[PDB]
């Protein structure tokens, strides 16, 4: 859903809504930044698209976008260029321009573009550059410094300077341009590491037609354009379509495998070109291409298909530049709790101009000092510590070996409910191994040998270390991972073909039958040193090879036993030899027909390869599953393999049931029809293919959603049933995560809100979470991270509003007495204490320990502001305490109403309030600062705990010692001892009851808050679904 609107220019409207904007007030400015739309509408005049000059764009947020003409009119929204078709009288993405062209369409253009056109699509498609948009520090320090909070900070500091609070003035000052370098810091740091990741500048020479070859820069290149690419190959700077020749390319940089792809030329024929279809055949943009092989032709020829941000690297680093907006609002009623404690200051305020009025002091000085009251709670410090918070999460997340690239982001892992796993390479190994191997005595299967080194030297052995189809490219096996494992797992060596004996003799290859996919086998020529004759191995189906084996070799427990491997989730594959009486030589053997090796052969063994399971992947799906967090397996291989390694793994624990969703086509003279298949070893999980998905998803709209809410496994899924998915999953109110570290998971791994690639770089692209760990323990880490960033961003929040609400209690009963709390104490308290407790508070790490109890969501709930209230008034208590007890005293002096502060500073009742509740922030602190269940106790945080110590030591200092800073902060010199000593016993009770209030609270009020209003459902489809399936199970 994107919406247009095209606004064509106008001078007159626009110079007036210029001098109107300038000369009026900053008010419109501010209401503009918050809706621009009255803004674009006031300033230039709606009309045709076609006259279109700055046109605005929904999708529901605003972006306004100019309209450049070259006649070619195009815009730029997000990176990708529209442009303007005259005949359709539209905007079309120039990443369609040429889409649905046919293969042949590709090997026509295969003889390049002619120079003239060449410009004109360079022209339309702009350069093959991914131009990330640098700006200049003035630019990024405009973009942050003209927040409105920034704003309201510097009117803060020029009533601070009217009121000749000076020290205070710098100490808002300081704080507020620490948190604008924070921003810049992290945002120039961003953009500094995608330029350089996005940069590419080569020479690459491109067949210009008529037969001769053109060299040009890198980013001269335009879709239709043919390449000619290095025989030693090199980097791809465009993303183009083979179309003669082979290479190896390593996917690395875009995709994340390290393994070389063979990557062929593109087949001729009538079908439309796909990137995905033929992804075979596409090369890709930021790839390192090994080698290129000039099979036909003198050199290897690619036709470039996508330049810019079209290619795939630049479809993910679009995606990074412009991320979709964080769907789940964490700070649920944030404006609620804002406008609670607005309405407490605004009382506050109110109180502060009564008594100002009642103290008899000038009009202009009382709307001085209810405007530095007002100012007070917008505490200078909560961006920057904000900001702090997401940075520590991050720093903690990438010394935990996990990278993300938006750290907004991670809170939601705090949030996620349901995690997905792709099956292989991320839960299980990333290929095949053996377990086993099956030889024969006769016509009877001999017991399982677990490693296949110890077999005696002898045909089959011969069978297991040769019959495959290795090439040794720097001096490294490459090609099926069946035949590396295998090969490797004999233990003999590569060295036509020879092969040394891991401990006896070298056997040769005389000649090899290359693997086919429609023959599902392949067979050699083989002798040795010491052989009467060649012997001929061939590896297969078991049921195809059985048959060219002879019956009289084959046991009667072959189709029993291989389908006992088949159903516990193996992979079995036959050896079968049979002597050739050809003398064994090169020539005589490079001459045998594939028929007479395939026929007659001898079943010698059975080779069993089935995908283990990592290590890692069992405790951590039992502890997500502890934790009542879904673990659902999205998987693309059989529906039995992944029902043997969803049971293996604990996603289906042996005391729940499986029920196998079935769903037939509605074929003609039939409806659409789901069966359930039970099967034998919250409790109730179902499997279900994607065919079975897709057909549920068009036919059974109502049954749907309780597929999703107890479906478990779901196998035989495509990437794009993979994306939709977790789109139907996040339907239902369920935060998802996705754990699949292939590329075929890319679009789920968008789509998801948590989405985390296994086997990654420092530099990685592919998901907004990559780590570099192979085991899926990265997943309960960024969950433990994600509800320990929550917790820390809560408990920020509750100290800036502990903190702000201290703090204009003080000044309010300081106004009361017609005093103040001085400019030093104002710098003190503000920067010495707050901000540093504030900025080391978030830097204590997550608890080691996944819990079932998840984090809140609602900043204004009942245990939160409760907890807010109840602070304020020990807080309240404390300090109108002292106040009240120093009256008592006998050496205590009131001060001189007379004059106002800081004239009447230092003074006793000044003195007092600004000890207690110099503590009072300390330990409010520390008071927020909760441990488990979602963080590590206070005091592994060392850089908090020794703030906390050495600040209320200085304090104490303050207090007890004479003559210590109470010449700069203008703190009165009590000469009583066993006043101050009450007064630490006060800070004492006010510390001892904060904690004890916390504890109170966490424990009983949850449990009183039930009792009170047990709740009446939750707002969740998903719970709701569950409840709905407890009250009566859908299948029957």
Known sequence: SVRLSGYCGSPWRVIGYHVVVWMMAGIPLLLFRWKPLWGVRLRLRPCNLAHAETLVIEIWQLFTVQVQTEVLRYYLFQGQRYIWIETQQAFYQVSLLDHGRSCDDVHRSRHGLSLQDQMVRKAIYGPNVISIPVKSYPQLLVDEALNPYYGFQAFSIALWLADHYYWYALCIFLISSISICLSLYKTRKQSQTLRDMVKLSMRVCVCRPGGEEEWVDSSELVPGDCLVLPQEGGLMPCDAALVAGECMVNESSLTGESIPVLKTALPEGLGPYCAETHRRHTLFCGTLILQARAYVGPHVLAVVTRTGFCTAKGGLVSSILHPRPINFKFYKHSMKFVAALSVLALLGTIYSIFIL????????????????????????????????????????????????????????????????????????????????????????????????????????????????????????????????????????????????????????????????????????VVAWPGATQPEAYVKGSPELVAGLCNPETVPTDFAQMLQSYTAAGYRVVALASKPLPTVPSLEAAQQLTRDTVEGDLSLLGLLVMRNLLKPQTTPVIQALRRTRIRAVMVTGDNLQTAVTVARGCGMVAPQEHLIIVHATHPERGQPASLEFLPMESRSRHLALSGPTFGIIVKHFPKLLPKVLVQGTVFARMAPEQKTELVCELQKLQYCVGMCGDGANDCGALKAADVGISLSQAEASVVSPFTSSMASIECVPMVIREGRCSLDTSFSVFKYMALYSLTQFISVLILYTINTNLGDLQFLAINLVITTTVAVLMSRTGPALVL?????????????????????????????????????????????????????NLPNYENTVVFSLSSFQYLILAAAVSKGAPFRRPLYTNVPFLVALALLSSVLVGLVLVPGLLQGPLALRNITDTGFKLLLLGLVTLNFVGAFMLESVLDQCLPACLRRLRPKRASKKRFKQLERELAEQPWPP
């Open 357 to 524: 009025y009642r103290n008899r002091v000038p009009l202009n000085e009382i709307v001085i000092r209810a405007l530095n009251l007002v100012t007070v709670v917008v505490p200078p410090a909560l961006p920057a510590a904000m900001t702090v918070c997401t940075l520590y999460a991050q720093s903690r997340l990438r010394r935990q070996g996990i990278f993300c690239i938006h750290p907004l982001r991670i809170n939601l892992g705090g949030k996620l409910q349901l995690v997905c796993f792709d099956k292989t390479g991320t839960l299980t190994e990333d290929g095949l191994d053996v377990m086993g191997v099956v030889p024969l005595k006769g016509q009877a299967f001999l017991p399982l040998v677990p490693e296949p080194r110890r077999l005696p030297v002898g045909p089959l052995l011969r069978a297991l270390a040769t019959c495959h189809a290795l090439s040794r490219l720097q001096d490294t096996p490459v090609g099926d991972p069946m035949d590396l494992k295998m090969v490797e797992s004999t233990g003999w060596v590569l060295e036509d073909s020879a092969f040394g004996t891991q401990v006896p003799v070298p056997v040769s290859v005389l000649h090899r039958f290359p693997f086919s996919s429609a023959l599902q086998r392949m067979s050699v």
């Open 851 to 903: 819990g079932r109890v998840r984090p809140p969501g609602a900043l204004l709930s009942v245990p939160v502001l409760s907890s807010l209230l109840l602070q304020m008034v020990l807080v309240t208590g404390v300090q109108l305490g002292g106040y009240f007890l120093t009256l008592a005293q006998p050496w205590f002096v009131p001060l001189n109403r007379t004059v106002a502060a800081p004239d």
